[PDB]
Amino acid sequence: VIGRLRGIILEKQPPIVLLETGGVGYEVHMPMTCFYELPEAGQEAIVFTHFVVREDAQLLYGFNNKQERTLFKELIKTNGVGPKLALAILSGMSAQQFVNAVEREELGALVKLPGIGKKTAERLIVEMKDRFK
Amino acid sequence: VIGRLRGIILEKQPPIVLLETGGVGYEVHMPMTCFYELPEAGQEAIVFTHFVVREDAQLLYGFNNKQERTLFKELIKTNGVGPKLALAILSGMSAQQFVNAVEREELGALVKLPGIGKKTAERLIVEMKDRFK
Amino acid sequence: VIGRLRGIILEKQPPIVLLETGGVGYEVHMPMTCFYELPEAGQEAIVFTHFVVREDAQLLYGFNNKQERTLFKELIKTNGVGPKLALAILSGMSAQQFVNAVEREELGALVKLPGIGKKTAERLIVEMKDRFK
Amino acid sequence: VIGRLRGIILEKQPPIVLLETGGVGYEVHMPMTCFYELPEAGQEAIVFTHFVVREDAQLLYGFNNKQERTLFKELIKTNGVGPKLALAILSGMSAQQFVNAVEREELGALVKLPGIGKKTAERLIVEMKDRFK
Amino acid sequence: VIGRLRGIILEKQPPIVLLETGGVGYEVHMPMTCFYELPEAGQEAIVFTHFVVREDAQLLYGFNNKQERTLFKELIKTNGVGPKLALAILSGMSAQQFVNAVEREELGALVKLPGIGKKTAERLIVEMKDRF
Amino acid sequence: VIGRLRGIILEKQPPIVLLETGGVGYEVHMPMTCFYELPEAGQEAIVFTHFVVREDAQLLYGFNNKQERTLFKELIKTNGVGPKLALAILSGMSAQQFVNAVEREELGALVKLPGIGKKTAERLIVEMKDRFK
Amino acid sequence: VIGRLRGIILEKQPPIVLLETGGVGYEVHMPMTCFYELPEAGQEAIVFTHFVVREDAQLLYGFNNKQERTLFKELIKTNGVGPKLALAILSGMSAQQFVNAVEREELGALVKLPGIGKKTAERLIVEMKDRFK
Amino acid sequence: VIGRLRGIILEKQPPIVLLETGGVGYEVHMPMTCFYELPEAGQEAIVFTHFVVREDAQLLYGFNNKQERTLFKELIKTNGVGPKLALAILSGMSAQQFVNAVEREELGALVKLPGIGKKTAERLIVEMKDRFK
DNA sequence: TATTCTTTAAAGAATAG
DNA sequence: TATTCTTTAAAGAATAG
DNA sequence: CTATTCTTTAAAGAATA
DNA sequence: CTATTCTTTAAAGAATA
């Protein structure tokens, strides 16, 4: 299980970034809004990752801060939320803003994000409100 | 997911090439006609790759140009076309020639390729014509 | 199959340790009581490992001594004893103490460990007593 | 797919050898009789490999010569012959001796090897005689 | 797919009833509270059923009224609600009472039933309120 | 495999009909337009059936004439056409009209049916035109 | 799920009996020692059954008394005890004798039965002793 | 498991026969040559059957004599011999003739049958010669 | 005509055309 | 008593005890 | 406004809380 | 001499030969 990658940025093409380590280039998926913090190509960068394995595919997701990775891992455990939707949420709201919205049940703050329906937002609040404690 | 490999060419035995990186040798499958561009053994080379995972096997395909990899990925999504047949198409025609043939429905230009039947060419045109747009 | 890792300690957060080798950081799970022997962060360390693969996840376990790894591999073959429970046993008792307890059938020595029920301890003795010989 | 490994011999414990490359130690299974050719521990060695993937396990097999690897790959395709039995055959007979025995149908030359039954030897000759041509 | 069974009652051992049709005896699972309506053994009875198939098992559930079967089928589509739990709900509340409780969000009316947790009751209301 | 059912009609609730045979009531799915031919409830009826089995469900489909069943079986072999869609086609057009439309490539005659898109109709013509011969 | 069968005995060929009901003949497996109680062929008989389903096969087991069926169902839940082995136990010992032996730990009373090993008998006692209560 | 069917013949369309029992019509597959012995439609008939189950399909095969069913069951256990091929063999040769040919290794007697290749015939003799004893 | 070789869903419910 | 958390075959046919 | 795309995938046991 | 361990795990389609 790859926990962190450090290497040279070869190419930047949202949502994918390519990092080279010892001649091996790794395809990393990243949130659209965190992409702005990556250095210019040819510079070294560091990214925290989570490794996903499926019967037909293997994928690697990256984040600029451990806080982001923690919230991502928690989201994907909620039924009906997969990696694509999870990245969308992190693109729309910062991790701290999301926690506040769930505790306050600001349904409208979630429904405005792309791809999230009314039923989905209700389900998220019901499930997530119990884990932050 | 390995996106690119850079290393020393150890052996060339069409259709397989062996690249060494840090003492690990990777088996790579490549189109017969792109094989002519690889440098002489012992020289460094760069190859773009796509990683395929199946219940009983893992395989790594390589291409000399991003254009080739893009068309390959699109072909394998078509039902009834797998990596073996896809490499044949890329061996027979250049990527640009293939696009022209599909848009023009030059059925004969495709059927002449080895391993492609009349029904197969009909299916390819019907599916691919809608994706290039 | 990864048999041993040698690298720099990046972070220590029981039960997980992060080792960096050539820019790749590996997540390793270790027994709570062996964690005390790891050097201070930034120093080099060596850990013997066992690689577990499942349909939905891949995991890497580490141990400070080959003796521990051998007993771990034997435990996980016993029905009902999974990697999580196996690490608990190794946390509570040294490998040598465990062997003695099984041969003597000291049921109380096992039942006192966290997460182990009376039925579980009975099952362990019945299965393990035949393998040490 | 790992095709070749080059590294330092860390430990030799038949049938397993441990090779270190860049701080990662790889477990490699090898034929009992080819093991005698490996250098002394601490020296560099080269081994040709084949990578086996299964739903519950991943394994890496190694051979000193490309000839051995080729015959191994052919054997494991025969129904009822698995990697364990395949290594036994390569331990008892050299690749050249095996070919001669099959073409001559020297049933006794095969049955004398450990773990091979009369039915198994008959099946091997029937299947293998057609592939060498 | 068996939709209805008509036959002679052979044995009654809650939660299972045994019905014989042409020499074949079918094991049927039923709600604990609907069991009281079944006639005396040896009499003919009619039961509406739903057929469940899994990789390792096949099961046949029965109900006295089409209303019950309809609500059962809807319950089992909710994530985390298995047939075992679904039968418990139908044992505790009538179909009409359940509908009212969901629309009114009377959380306490659900949590009192055996096996139903607070989180489960919240989940049920959120999912079911949209289907009726 | 149940090939035909003969019994008493118990209930008629499109698209499902319930037939009783010896105290067992079978749920049968039928085309919306063939439902008009079924006798009044309480009368005996005959229906030709096809039995579908899946990992999670078993289903039984019925038709008034062998011609209908034959075309249904051929449709479901085409990739992307499920039993639900197949019943829709048989509801919109008679079996004879469908054959004529495919041979003539009357794309508009198909696209007007509910649930069938332009791409779907193109795929159907390409695949079906070869089987009627 | 078939719970009971009543019909005419067509054939008796231990361990299989064939019962006809309405023109359908069902294959039933029965314990070797209960087979002696079945009436002469052509007479009616009653047998309690348990239905077993697997990915590749379906099987139907029968017993003369509910007591036997209950113990059979309990046995097959024990890990390592297959239906074949469970029928052997019921052939060697009556249900009542088995209960007495387990509670008394009369290991020799079990090991003497065909196909039962020492390890198996130990496992059986450990698991079954807790369920009769 | 349906072992025998008795009922009225509804339709005869090689290789399928349709038998009605209590209003349920069963599709039965039979050898081309045994089909000649079936009575005229509307008469009662008896057929011995074997029930095959797969993840995607259920099928029922029938034979006029227990001898045929016994040989069929044995053939399908041989690797590479499917039910389709097994019915072909029984169409070409009587059960008694087949046994004689295997014991004598009359390769030509088998290769002449449709669908059977030289490699297949060799494999059959090797496997079947050991079971009749 | 035999040969060996490949290639592997449907629904729902959200947003586009 | 509810909670969340884990853990996942059978056969054959060769060889030991 | 209707079609097209996409994407996502069990429950019971027996401990402990 | 009889028990214990182990180890291994589809077929049809439609091309081409």
Numbering used by the authors:
A (entry chain C), B (entry chain B), C (entry chain D), D (entry chain A), F (entry chain J), G (entry chain F), ...: 1 to 133
E (entry chain H): 1 to 132
From the manuscript:
The central and universal element in genetic recombination as well as in double strand break repair and in the process of replication fork rescue is a four-way DNA heteroduplex called the Holliday junction. In prokaryotes, the two proteins RuvA and RuvB play critical roles in the processing of the Holliday junction by promoting the ATP-dependent unidirectional strand-exchange reaction known as active branch migration. In bacteria, the Holliday junction is processed by two homo-hexameric AAA+ ATPase RuvB motors, which assemble together with the RuvA–Holliday junction complex to energize the strand-exchange reaction. Here, using time-resolved cryo-electron microscopy, we obtained structures of the ATP-hydrolysing RuvAB complex in seven distinct conformational states, captured during assembly and processing of a Holliday junction.
The cryo-EM structure of the RuvAB–HJ complex resolved to a resolution of 8 Å revealed highly flexible and linearly arranged tripartite assemblies, with eight RuvA molecules symmetrically arranged in two tetramers (3.3 Å resolution) and the four-way Holliday junction flanked by, and flexibly connected to,﻿ one or two RuvB hexamers (2.9–4.1 Å resolution) as well as bipartite particles (3.9 Å resolution). In both particle types, DNA enters and exits the RuvA core as a double helix, with one or two hexameric RuvB motors engaging the minor groove of the rejoined DNA. The RuvA core is physically connected to both RuvB motors through RuvAD3. As the DNA substrate already refolds into a double helix within the confinement of the double-tetrameric RuvA core, we propose that the RuvB motor rotation is powered by the rewinding of the translocating DNA.
